[PDB]
Amino acid sequence: TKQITLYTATFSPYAHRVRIALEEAGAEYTTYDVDILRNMPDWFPLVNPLKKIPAMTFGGPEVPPDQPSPESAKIAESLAMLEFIADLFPDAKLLPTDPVLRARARTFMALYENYVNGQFRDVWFLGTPADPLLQALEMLQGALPPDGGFAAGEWSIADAAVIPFLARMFPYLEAGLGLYSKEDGVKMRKAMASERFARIRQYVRDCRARPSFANTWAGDAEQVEAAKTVPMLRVGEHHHH
Template sequence: MSETKRITLYGAIDSPFPHRVRLALEEAGATYDIIWISLIYDKPEWYEQKVNVGVGKVPYLVYGGPKLNPGDAPSPETVQVSESLVINEFLADIFPDAHLLPTDPALRAKARLFAQYVDAKFLPAFAGFVFGLGTPVEGLLAAIEGLQRMLPAEGFAVGEWSIADAAAMPLLMRLNQVLELKPSMIKRDAAAQVVEALASPRFARIHKYTADNVARPSMAKTWDRVRLVYSCGELHDAQRRSALVQAAIDAETTKRIERLMKTGKLNSDLTIPVPVQP
């Protein structure tokens, strides 16, 4: 693909998975459109009927074609890609000068293994803890510790920033958010134990890793919720510019948690047993 075409991303403000793609797009310096889809209440019928047909999940990326508005069906001549990690690999290919993946084959493999660990180990522990599905404190901390062990002594997941970091950071940011919001499905002593542990020398490397990511313009552009446990006091004034976006993210997350506690609906597609109130 010799020329960059129009990029349209379908996403949801409170989901970490479209956030992964936005980080990659910002790091690439790409121009792109976003069409927001609500995950809290029923998604619009047109999304599953005309866009991500029969699936309806976000993120979904359309490459090429004319400008899309909500309710439009992408042209069949466009390239359409789903799944955040796959989308980011696609972006690394169409923006080679952005170096979203290293050129060295060994480092590319390491980046992919890091992202794989995030989805195979850290994501289940995160979801199990945050949504009251039985992950104990030490289970969550062990998953974060495993992530930390994969980091080099300095820098990002493979030294220079890559889409491996885009895989991890949206989940780490939302863990901090939830620890602040203190939803009722997480026992207060459990949340306090996690906060205390993450502030301890045991997690000094993940603390620095998170702070380094937060300091990047891509994070400031895509995540304006700046009250973070990991990087308190290390943010620049330019990154404090949008309290309105921060409030919107918090409000969406709070709504999702409230509905989960009442109905067991995690999003429009997934229902779990109603969490037991601690």
């Protein structure tokens, strides 16, 4: 009965995680875009004092999203939201029931957050060399079951956590968006098309094929256009050596 409102933005992979999870849960919920990076509403710190997207409200009285109520629970951090949605919709099996397989899902999420996401940040926002990122992606790929399936076998929130980032990489590369040089851009594209990364391409296809992805993705070209609005992606700018 308790309402869910997700404050969102199309460019944001962190918001995308939570939308995918709500889709897989079969939840009833509201999304409300926020221009967090250019024109933050002055009421936004009431739903998240960290001034980051996503933000979530839960319960309280039904109110327009730009008039959040003090009675709703204010939930921050995308992975905490993923675990919360799993807790709220236990019959949707957003996590395995078996402890070791659940652990595989939590490990995959931590591998992405601890070793991969910062390399994406380095390469795309600072234009540092791509090799440490390719190395971290090979490590992540290796945590996948090699003969197919999702991170923990069956689909789980761990795949919600990771696919927003991997799904952005390919079209952003094809647009040359990000502070890396053309040389590293070509090197990444060749690498991500090579047999070294066949397994992660299968993984990206399997995740994108689910309705939770189709329903929360603007389309490749539209997502590239939203990403061009991100100040830190510095459209037209590239660093060399």
